[PDB]
Amino acid sequence: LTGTGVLTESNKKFLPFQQFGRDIADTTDAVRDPQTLEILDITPCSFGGV
Amino acid sequence: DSTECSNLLLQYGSFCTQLNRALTGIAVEQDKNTQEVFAQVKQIYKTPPIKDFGGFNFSQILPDPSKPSKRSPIEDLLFNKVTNGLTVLPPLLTDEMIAQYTSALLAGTITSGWTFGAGPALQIPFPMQMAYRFNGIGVTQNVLYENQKLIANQFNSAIGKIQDSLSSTP
Amino acid sequence: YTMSLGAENSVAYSNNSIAIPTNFTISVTTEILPVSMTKTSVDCTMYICG
Amino acid sequence: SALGKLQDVVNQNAQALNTLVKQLSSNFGAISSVLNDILSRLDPPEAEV
Amino acid sequence: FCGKGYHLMSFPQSAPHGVVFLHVTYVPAQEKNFTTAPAICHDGKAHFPREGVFVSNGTHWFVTQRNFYEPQIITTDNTFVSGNCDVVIGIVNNTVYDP
Ligand SMILES: *[C@@H]1O[C@H](CO)[C@@H](O[C@@H]2O[C@H](CO)[C@@H](O)[C@H](O)[C@H]2NC(C)=O)[C@H](O)[C@H]1NC(C)=O
Ligand SMILES: *[C@@H]1O[C@H](CO)[C@@H](O[C@@H]2O[C@H](CO)[C@@H](O)[C@H](O)[C@H]2NC(C)=O)[C@H](O)[C@H]1NC(C)=O
Ligand SMILES: *[C@@H]1O[C@H](CO)[C@@H](O[C@@H]2O[C@H](CO)[C@@H](O)[C@H](O)[C@H]2NC(C)=O)[C@H](O)[C@H]1NC(C)=O
Ligand SMILES: *[C@@H]1O[C@H](CO)[C@@H](O[C@@H]2O[C@H](CO)[C@@H](O)[C@H](O)[C@H]2NC(C)=O)[C@H](O)[C@H]1NC(C)=O
Ligand SMILES: *[C@@H]1O[C@H](CO)[C@@H](O[C@@H]2O[C@H](CO)[C@@H](O)[C@H](O)[C@H]2NC(C)=O)[C@H](O)[C@H]1NC(C)=O
Ligand SMILES: *[C@@H]1O[C@H](CO)[C@@H](O)[C@H](O)[C@H]1NC(C)=O
Ligand SMILES: *[C@@H]1O[C@H](CO)[C@@H](O)[C@H](O)[C@H]1NC(C)=O
Structure with missing residues (x-):
């Protein structure tokens, strides 16, 4: 799963079978990393108009 | 009826939902338009059986009871002179209902002037209503009261000319 | 049902009778009119291509 | 339902935005609806298509 | 245009993405x-009302007055004269007080 963003700690209660989270736009919203099995939140990097 | 075509069309997402939603918005907007234009009174007014309005003749614009549609002669002429997944939705108000609105508006303005548009309908004799309207344009009442027969004749001739002009112009 | 257009009223018209209000009601009614929408800007390049 | 007009304007704007967001999840006949997947799966000649 | 009835004044009220008008009528x-x-002979x-x-x-x-029942004695101050009584249809006979 390729993408760009800021990876932070998450407080979302992922069930054990659940791997990743998805938003309305079908982009990944959270991920469970291998080798640690901990739940990471994915937030897009800052952007806006100039 | 093609299943493969619908399967391919599923790739495009919710385009059909957008189109149907826009058409539904237009369809409800048409009924709303008709309500705003015609449903301006909550009271269905009726003219008295005797048509004594001080010489003023409203026969060409009042409903004709003889016709099945209960339409005025001018309204009858107007309705005569205007002639794959696609459906036409009928309007919420029928033509009879819109004609009944117009009849109520005509009866209210003939029997009560402008009073029914601002509150309860207050009856007033029609030559006196037209005298009020003459005051509204800066003309005294006596000008009308002394010329009431002439004004009534001019109004009747003008209405007849309206009917003739509508009938004879394509 | 066939909807009713309104309450039936027969105004008592005659050629020498008038109705004059002996009182009045001070009425206050609301009219709601939209003025503006939400100002949304869409970065076309970022929407299409990220 | 007194304030129905303003709520209708807000609902239409939010619904249009949500429809625009949801349109990103459609692949329009492509192999995937995710650009990252296509870029990490295919060479430029076919990823371009 | 400004409510149902004879408009007196309106009050504006701010609303989210809109305005609310309180129409006092x-x-x-x-x-x-x-x-x-129509006239008094x-x-x-x-005599016609001013x-x-x-x-x-x-x-x-x-x-x-036409919008509120406030009956007054028919005088030469609140009426004006125009012609005789033979033209107006429906003119009725009554005295007109002279102050
Ligand atoms: C009001 O106008 C109508 C039509 O303009 C008059 O009806 C006509 O009446 C005459 C004789 O009374 C007939 O010869 C015509 O054929 C009628 N025309 C139509 C179209 O019906 C009516 O008489 C007028 N007056 C009143 C009081 O209704
Ligand atoms: C003015 O008088 C007329 C008739 O004298 C009244 O009209 C009648 O009202 C009653 C009560 O609703 C009805 O049953 C009759 O059918 C009406 N007659 C007609 C010819 O319309 C009228 O209500 C009176 N107005 C006021 C304000 O008292
Ligand atoms: C005009 O209408 C008003 C109501 O809008 C009448 O005022 C009421 O009078 C009664 C008895 O006099 C009181 O019990 C009410 O409390 C009054 N209402 C209000 C809102 O003050 C008034 O009496 C009417 N006047 C005439 C001449 O009919
Ligand atoms: C019409 O109004 C007039 C004046 O308001 C009434 O005349 C008065 O009536 C009262 C009540 O009986 C008497 O006490 C007065 O002496 C009368 N004044 C005059 C100058 O005559 C009249 O009665 C009213 N008519 C009706 C049918 O209500
Ligand atoms: C109003 O008053 C006039 C004059 O006072 C009345 O006219 C008179 O009518 C009688 C009979 O109708 C005649 O004999 C007189 O010659 C008329 N006089 C004039 C000067 O025209 C008139 O009839 C009255 N109207 C009503 C409805 O009472
Ligand atoms: C290796 O990954 C597995 C999950 O497949 C995990 O249970 C294990 O703890 C990982 N080991 C190390 C040393 O990270
Ligand atoms: C009103 O009509 C009656 C007949 O019902 C008549 O006698 C009277 O003169 C008419 N009045 C006016 C002002 O037309």
């Missing part, structure tokens, strides 16, 4: 039947 109430005439002169309308409570004729 005058609504006539408690109407009463009267017998009316007096001394062979036709601002109001001739009304009769059954036996006596008054002149009142």
